[model samples]
Target chain A: MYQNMLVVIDPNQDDQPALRRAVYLHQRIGGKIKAFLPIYDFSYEMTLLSPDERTAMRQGVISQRTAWIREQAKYYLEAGVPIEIKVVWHNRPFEAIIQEVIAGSHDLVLKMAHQHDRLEAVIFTPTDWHLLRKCPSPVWMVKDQPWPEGGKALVAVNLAPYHNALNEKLVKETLQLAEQVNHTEVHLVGAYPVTPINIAIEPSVYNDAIRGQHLLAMKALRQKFSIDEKVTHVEKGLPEEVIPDLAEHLQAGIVVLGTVAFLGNTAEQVIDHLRCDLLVIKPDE
Target chain B: MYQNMLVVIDPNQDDQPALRRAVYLHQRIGGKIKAFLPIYDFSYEMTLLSPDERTAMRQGVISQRTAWIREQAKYYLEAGVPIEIKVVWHNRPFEAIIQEVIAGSHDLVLKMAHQHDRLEAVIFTPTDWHLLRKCPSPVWMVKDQPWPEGGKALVAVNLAPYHNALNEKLVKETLQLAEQVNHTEVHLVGAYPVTPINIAIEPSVYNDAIRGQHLLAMKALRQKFSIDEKVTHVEKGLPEEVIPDLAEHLQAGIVVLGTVAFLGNTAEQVIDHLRCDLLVIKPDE
Candidate 1:
């Protein structure tokens, strides 16, 4: 699904999970990779430091990161994945990363996940949230899990009538992405409310009717997409609960889902709860 | 519709078109205003300037802008619209603006447009593009066009099946926005291709069938949304052609649109060609 990958190097960390993930994907899917290291040194805050000293400090960080990336690139270069390195001096990491995404027209951003202990969320800092919501490209939060050969890449889609445009696009793109990734079976999953709320005397009727409608919708979706019925799963439960449960049961390599606006807190929760890697798609239009 | 507007004051420019526009909107629809100025000095690159001198330079810009904003506010404050000022020292204007948007949960950003003569687009610099694509709140590109009473607010939408999430969200949000803005009418407009091609010789039937299908979809859309038939326009032409033509015919006060992924240069062209104010909404979700 990704053509040009922007591997965001965590300046404070030693591990290059993002880089390795990009390389792993590149080994299977041929694409160019750029290792981006954005270093922010606000030497201007120090009153005693002269401009020359500040410049030296900035230069030191830049050169060090540049060298570090080159050294890291060597380990992956043998796999024949074309790579480049970019180190920019910018205080705001998200801003720098977004600019690079736009300027380079990068197809996907590979960023490492950070476990926010207090929040119990797997966040890539505030920058990851911004990139997830705002960046022009899809963002892949690379986990330690590897995509083994003939693995399953589970894509969770909303086949509901509400927001039809985005939902349909999600399926179409997800299917296309399924073709791109080295997944043996690209399962499309959806969730519906477990039960209908009713205070009326005819509560049983409403429950059966509502549940039947969702089942019918799922059935229609299967026929509409011409998918083998075996690969499609439509469960009656909250999506937050149903999605991860099935992903773990199936041992899926990655979970693909669409993120909507104002889904910040909810989206973070989903990312944190999911044990597998994640590829979040913000609807193209 | 906007409340609590953030008027981004471009320090390089003297005239406050954005401020004036925000004030203009506030006059009709009451809202608070904040004139935000993000200052950055390139002292890091200079070999001679001391850190104190750099700080002093940034402080100078801040105070000057504060005074300038206060002077501008007097003209609007007399009309009873509350106004305030904010200045931050940040190299990336978009980053600072986004942070403010998240922090204050500001509804709209009124920013001055920068005409890229080469691109012939009214861009707010690279920073403006970033804000347009990334900012959580809606961004209104305030041009010189005055919003007269009963002026049309044209909303351009893609009724295509691709990326369903954003498109439906675009229309839903557009209608909601139509209720919020001061415009007399919010016209929903879409365009379909003139003809369809086929390898088979019976091209006429295929073309008419496809076109009819699109027309039916648009009709369904109009009936479902309860939009006035007179206000709904489905033309057979390219969107770039159909949209601008109708917007001008209505003498639109503002043109609302959703920018798809990778619409950078082409989107710039469309924005540049328009002669009215612009409201760009990035789909929430």
Candidate 2:
């Protein structure tokens, strides 16, 4: 059973669902909560201040901001969730966030979902999408909704050795999340990369590598997580083509992923294909 | 002169240049400032509470939230920028924003530039990505060090007529923003889309369209926005393919675009391409 989940809070709005879900998870698993709000640079005047003074100024800001954040954590506080408040400053937001994961030894990052355009911009601009292309942590991109009833979670797995490390980590993460929420079912997936671009141009001839890749992903998931497994076929013409079709097929509540940071354009391609809720985490963050 | 602009404020760490830029803008435009924080769903609990009691509870919640929002607004307010505060609740944030925008007749909405991510998510998905996709008003996805000298502002345009209509909206809005900010250097660019796929097989016809499209878009831009124009071109497959390619091709200081309307698959495709350093507005919204 995993514990110690971290949530990035926006002080501007009262984030009820995100707060509630965090609390609900804490109630089920004994853990600590660390809330970090990076001081976003608004003015160059801030540079005029001394580093110590700058830290002091940022702390003062955090002190003022923590009130509402505390209010959101009100219910969770009594539940024995040791919530730590962190205020740090970094120019690069993604690197700062990843460093938080490293420093905190945080297993999972729970975030409010950003819009697709922003996500696309982040990924496509070859900037932050570059990080999503490379970060080793599994991140659950959540929507602003009331806690789901019956607690069913979807585990997006590849059933192939290619993503074995990522898939094993993803399944375990999903199971931990699903079990904590008293989720009744976990929809497991082992997808194939059968796109024509991935295969030699025999048209319909079976390549052992393609079939083997699909089978290995599932075998790893079952052996490692020991959860019940299922198969999902991707009928694309390239090695990278079919993950989206299978995700849609499952109507996945949260599509678990192994953030494959910019490995060519594949990172952008995966994000492009998904519309339903997704939960992406690093295999070894 | 449309003085008395209401700027909907979100807290960014602090950008002195931008803030100073705003101070300069208020003086230049000559307006009383009003800062708004539209709480997404603060008093919805009124639906659960009894009618008589509901009003008090809603009031209680509003007062608390308003105070919280005001504190963030207080900085600009104290900067003596002639600003007021307003806080309201709506189930859909964009609706509240649009209604406020229209009703208030505010000249512009000044949102803090949110930080962009650089590290790739090995397996990450985000929810907020959708909000930027369907925002009902002009949203500036601001970023970078608030340039102290507060450098150049350029308008991104498409030279083709149908497309130019969309691009002009972006240029016009930013031109006004530049005027408000006392920004002197305003450059307009029309990224011509003349792709091999869309081109005639004959070289002469393709060459003609490229030149014709480039000249037409630039001419219309000069007439429409009436700014000294800078024409640019990219012979790409699609606008999605062309705009960002052009933006990077020239190392544009900033790129403003008319976002694809949130209606069908095509809109999402445009968003998929414009994830970073972008500001998106829809025509007729």
Candidate 3:
């Protein structure tokens, strides 16, 4: 049930894990892979400390970084992924990353950023908060244990908007990513709010619609790979409110989404509002 | 109905389309309008510039700018908008304006700046990008529009995963934004599945979740507003897919979302995704 996924990486770190994640996800879902890395800051003009200086500096970082980046890039390249690499020199990484997403481009973006310290041991990594507020792309920020280990990918599907084309790319990506990692069960989830809301509405109208959308998505899902539907689940409630509950109920190691709007902060304005690693994607729309 | 809205201005211009759009929207929504503008970028450090030079620069633009701002301020003031005015100076217009949105914490943000840079044609300004992407607040950008007379606030809801929180917020905000205009009514929609992949999966799970979420959300919505619940709908397909289909289905005057990805070139994305007035809000969740 797990699938195609996007893998994100830091410009300065080893991208091997991210690629490994993508590969594993693709293996599990039998899906394509895409990789993105936001070039947060660049110094085109400042590079000229003199030709000699520029060359020396470029040699210092560019060669190593390029090799590392290519280590991940080659797989996407070999697999012929519709992959893209975005570079932005703004101090605010979240805003730029969001712009990349709002452009109705890439589906999911994986993040592998290291934490840094502020003054007096105050640590600050706003990527989490930023993702919540503005990210158009659902983010799967790899942390703790490496992904695809459990050989599973959990997708949060909107049952009401079941035939949601906008999230198709995201869902497909998740399914494919999960398959790539290993042929783990790609868990399909239909989340709902268990209450008066569901009971009072015109079930025939909405239910028929979700049924229609769901059937179509699944049909397409199976054509790509021979997978069973047993892993699929239907739950109800706010994602943040119920995802953990559902995850714990299912014993999921990693959860998937079309994308998550994670604003890395504790303030009311910024917080990781969704559960699991989000895989936000723009529908072909 | 419209309660409070913010109008962004150049402060130097008397009647730019941006402010005019804000005014029209406020008037239609029956909401009070507050106008503001960021001060011009001042590269000349005060400490470096002579007093005389500073004074000259101030008169060259500052005085006239203030006078013009006051003139525009008067128009809103006369309209019983409970108008307020502000001017801030920062190199980044988007940041300055966003800070205004957060500091002031208004419902919607409106601006008209460089809709088309001569030949550039309908390109987005930094302010538009920021308002859409970074601002937690729901923002409406006004540029090349005669503006809507306002009648209905079309709401988009993802009925699956039954993101109850997002759906509820969408409905509530739609009602609030719809109230600004005379004869304004809320058009609630739950975008459901319509993809081919979902077709194979017995939508029993998907439909069940949507039914539960839809009933509870609609009930609470109607009870809270005391409005009839007949208009709420749960349609199949992705938001980018179903919302537009429903909008065409409803020929809605304006479509509003509880939360939509607000960032770069998202305008085209939203248009492609759905049809409506485009009132995307982030759920308090």
Candidate 4:
């Protein structure tokens, strides 16, 4: 499905994790890669320059960036990977990336996560949030870490009755991905609610009953997907907390999760806490 | 079809602008209103109490909030508007709202815009962004201002060839909204790009040519919708700047815009800049 991949090139960084991830995926899925960089300088916004001068300056900047991107892609290019380079003048990086995704009909977008450390957790930037919330194609946020051998692909899902359809779609897609990638083991995680204080105060039996319900739901999901119980987990806590904690515990190479288009915050919350790469999928519109 | 409306109640605010806006819409389009309040306390997360005691305390908090929401909705209830009150215990406000929207099959969500002062403009909060990005239903962010007589409803659209379908959808839906509400006029605005520096440095004729192309696109749109030229604006600037400026200049009561599910940043950028109420629509999946 990933026939065409768009790799966002960060000019500020020497390490191109996004490009590397794209090449990794290309090796397995056979996709052509486009190395795209969006550049802008405040001087371009100044009104002092003549229209011609402004055009010349912008072009000069773009040309230089294009060359830089090409140089960065030289290794992958020489290795015989189908790589194309593009640099555009755009003030908003997310907007440029999304527009390129739509214009090029790229199936997947790969970008290195711009993480800031805050109280021992990595937080995403505004651009990252924008891409997560709005980009049409699946966004793969690559971390600067090598995929460990026999790395696990953890798929976070909701076992709620209403989310059954989405859960199935998520598991199916994740399985397909695992099959494509080498030495990848698939795991499923569902976060169940803790007994509500009101419900908990009733009978001690109620707690077990609630847990039973979650177990039953998880059982049904596993049965349908033919998932092994050893690799599936149903924990009690907030999804934002449970998913990330489980992902870390499993040392997941990539976490695959579903985001309802224009809905749901759990994925966004878990993403920031994750130490591994992320593959975000959306249900068919 | 604004039928089932969810009005998010802000317990911190004495003036329930979201409720008021829902009542206004109910008066015009005749929708059932649900007053939803999501409440949670840090104490609920503490482990000091017995499970039963914790449940009781959480229930008490929710019960109190439910009573408060009912008290706020009393006026509307007496006035013959179908209003239901819901108070849910959830750490994240946006998550609770989206879940309720899905469960209740809510067609529209109305909430007060939580604004923070930044420089000369107002900015949206995290909860607001979450709802705008993820809520399944159309979200109406109500500004605390009365709709003046003959207040215009401005619709921001992209006239690019690729966006023609969405442009039509946006205009048609906006027109429908105007027809439902009293003393509401419809206005269309399209923002075209400034000539690229590279393109501008070419011939002087190129600038005029670019302008001509935008005008032609706008003209085609107007002719298709039979919109009067007097009420339409085709500006040259960033859409984030141009759209909001025109809305304010028109003294619009509501601004209608379209967001692609999990894609497009223009609507989000424009939403924070506008002074009037906002109605965000998504293209059919």
Candidate 5:
């Protein structure tokens, strides 16, 4: 499924976690890699420049960036991976990347995730948010870590009545990725909301009902997907908190989730709290 | 400052709140309008088609959409508003819109916010989140309701250390918008986190200290901005809740906030809860 992988290059950083992740996947799955960089010069917006002059300056900047990216890919080139370098002149990096995705018909996008030192939280840049929310292909935000041997892949699904299709998609995609990787174990997790305080005066009874409902839903999903009961979990809490806790406890290499256009902020919330790598999918039309 | 407005047209719905809001601003501030629609066809992805054939099919679809958009703009055209109609063929609508913003150098982007009937919450589409996060210019998400007379313009600011530049930018932008729109009152709000429970055993003392720190920060900001003390507020709560609650209490027309790349989920959380219009600004590099 990840036959054509697009690796987003960060010009500001010397390290290239995204490229390493792409190469790691490429070693196993045999996919072509494109290291893409979107560069812009503020001087291009100068009002005094003629259109031809502006074009030449922008082209010169692109050429410089293109050479830099190729130099970064020199190791892979020597290893015979034949990584392609693409540099474009665009003011907005995310939009340029998305346009390239559509034009190139790339199947998967990989980018490094930024972290905030003081807060010890994942600092998602505007470009990362845009790609996560709007990119048609699945986006894999890579952290600077190697996947442990026999790493676990956790897929978070919403077991609501109308979410059957989305849940299936998330499970199938996760399974495909795990199968391709050959050494990863796939797990399923579903988190149901906690009962509200007012209704929880009879706390045990109401909480039991909520938990039972989610368990039954989870049961049917597991049966449909033939998932092992031991690996499937149904917990009582917010997904944002519960999923991340479970992933950490399991030491998952990646957490997979589906995002719907009309659904609220569940994916974004879980994304903020996740410490492992993330693979975000969109529901099929 | 709100001279060139880009109104995103939703083809599926009859109600055009974005168009109406753009016209409302145009009437007051005397700016031009461009109604943009991004249309795509899955058939264009057919592998059997030649490049020329695919181009022809896409252009035909774009032409049909262009005519439909122009028909929707008939009223404004007849009223001598001269609203420009632009239609492009692109799978991702938000990327196309952002590219147009850069090409046209439009100052503001206005788009209708979708509502979820079952949940009674604002349903932000993938496009909305993308534009809000990545669009370079200010984005104004318009609701269906008209701006009430003598409406309040609430600006949410962060008073933490190193946020002074962002706070100044947000306040300056909000004040300029209120001045141009006229008949709008400007207000500033800062929200501080509640003390943790472990430390809050001495609850009142710790809470009071937190509130006092916030108040002093708010006071300094007010002094710098020359804002009236009565119009400034400091609350001990999450900004996502406090800002929306205060905005609803004041019946604010718009809540303006600045988004920084490294910051966490405050803006996204606030956007989800807000009922009034929202203006998102990015910190200057």
Candidate 6:
């Protein structure tokens, strides 16, 4: 499904992780890679330089950064991937990346995730945060560790009554990527609250109707995707509680989740809880 | 505009910051406060406890937390603000808080913001993140610092073309909140790219039409909100880059911004950049 890949690399830190993952994906998906490096001269106290001087300074910084990125891309170049480098002089990295994504019509952005030392909290840089929340294109925040060629891929979906359209789309996209990549097995996971809200709000119809409908929808999607019943799981709990454990239990390397405009923070929450690599897909516009 | 306030407190740490801000808001806005404390027992290693034992343990934790919250609310209660405490035993605090917001129809959620020691990064607990993204009601993430009684309130809006419906709602609601709260000046701010993308894409249009349209929209919004022309800001840059400096220059106590479902990470980035308190509002369903 991915055609043009935009790899946003940090000019300050080592861009190896992001580059490796993007190159790996490009090798398999047969797409061109644009290595985007956004640079800023924070040492400049103010806009004091003349127009000519400013342009020269920006050009100097861009060329230096361009060289650095080219040095990193040597391996990818040797691997036969069509990779190009683009550098922009922008103070805000995330905004520049988003604008590039729109202007270039890139399908995916591969970024690296950083960890905070104290609580081992996943520290999503402001750029990372922006890409996760705003980019129209799907973002793959690749972990430092490489994704095994034949590792497990988990797809998390919601099968509530009114979410049939969204549920179907999520499953199809998840399976499409799973099939495209070399995943050994694809697992479908859905979570329902232990006590459904409606059951608590109105005790009028106290039965397994809610759970039954959830299971039935899961069965249909499983059959459509040809996912084995053993790997298809529906549990009674909050998603944040269910998905991570399931991923761990199945030794999944990557988890795919769909972000809907109307869906509340389920995708983001599930994202924050797991350490596995994430493939965040948004519904078609 | 807020008559009922739900304040979520972290029972494990000092709840003073969140509690103090909630009480301050209540004293100003004339709202009844419901202090909610969701406590979890990490000591339970096994599911071997009898149902009765589990019930008693949960009840004991709730009573203890309720008493603690009540002790903290004594000041508000003495100040004639109707303050009450409710405690629930839940593993996932965010889900519990969302449930309470829906069930109680709370008008606002006043939450505390924590900073990580090593990174100084704003540590938004899962509950805080959930409330910020999904709560039906407006959420005020109050930092430890109390809001000054009559400080400036800055409203960040999206006045660019194609966001008319969303822009109108954002500007109107931002001004509405500013007028309702105790801000000395209500400022409207919008950011346009340094060089309009259309100008770059189509070199044929070399005029400042994009800038003119942006200025016109900001002026219209300013006049509609009855805000002074001097306080209206239209800068040539990204909002994340412009708004924070303006907020610092204005010494704004609280900045109001609208979060769009599809806008992605702009709102989140702006929120993360500022040191002042935040008032987050979403468009009507």
lDDT of 5 at A17: 91
lDDT, model 6? 0.71
Instruction: Assess candidate 2 and give its lDDT.
Output: 0.51
- TM-score of the second chain in candidate 6: 0.87
State in Å the error of residue B264, model 5.
19
Model 6: per-residue Cα lDDT over A1-285, one tens digit each: 777989888665655687787777776677888999887653222233356755666677778778788888887787678988999888677789999999999988997876443224345665675577788888888776545456688888886644666667777876777677665578888876554332232121222555676688899888876778998998867788889888877878778888762235577667777767888877666
Highest-scoring model, TM-score: 6
Give the CA lDDT, 0 to 100, for residue A41 in model 6: 53
In model 5, which regions exceed 4 Å deviation? A50-53, A117-119, A146-150, A198-203, A261-263, B1-285
Error of 3 at A113 (Å): 23
Candidate 3 vs candidate 4: the lDDT winner is: 4
Between 3 and 4, whose TM-score is larger? 4
List lDDT for all candidates, in order: 0.69, 0.51, 0.51, 0.77, 0.78, 0.71
lDDT of 4 by residue, B128-162 (tens): 77788788778888776556457799988776545
**Clashes in model 6: which pairs?**
A134-B264
Predicted candidate 3 versus true structure: per-residue lDDT over A1-285, tens digit per residue: 323344555654554455565565554445545454543212222211357743444454444444556665776667765444433344345666666565646555566533232111111134543564455555555532333235356666554344456346556666655554445566766544332331232133433444455456555554444546666665444455555556545655566554323321111211133223334343333
Best by DockQ: 6
lDDT of 5 by residue, A63-87 (tens): 7777777777788889999588998
On TM-score, the stronger of 1 and 3 is 1
Model 3: residues >4 Å from true position, as ranges?
A1-285, B1-4, B10-14, B21-32, B42-55, B70-82, B102-108, B113-124, B136-138, B148-150, B161-166, B198-230, B260-277, B283-285
Candidate 2 lDDT by residue in tens digits, A1-285: 446666766544676444455666677776676776654432212123367754554555656567657777776777567888776665455567778878888766665653444223212222234335444555555555433344345555543235656666666666766766666467665444432231121133334555564556556557565655443332333323455555445544555555552332333346645544456565454
Error of 1 at A238 (Å): 1.7
For model 1, give the TM-score of chain B.
0.83
User: Over the stretch B166-279, how does candidate 2's per-residue lDDT look in tens digits?
Assistant: 776677777776666656455555443342321121134544656665666577567676655354343434555655555445544455656541322223334455423445
* Docking band of candidate 2: incorrect
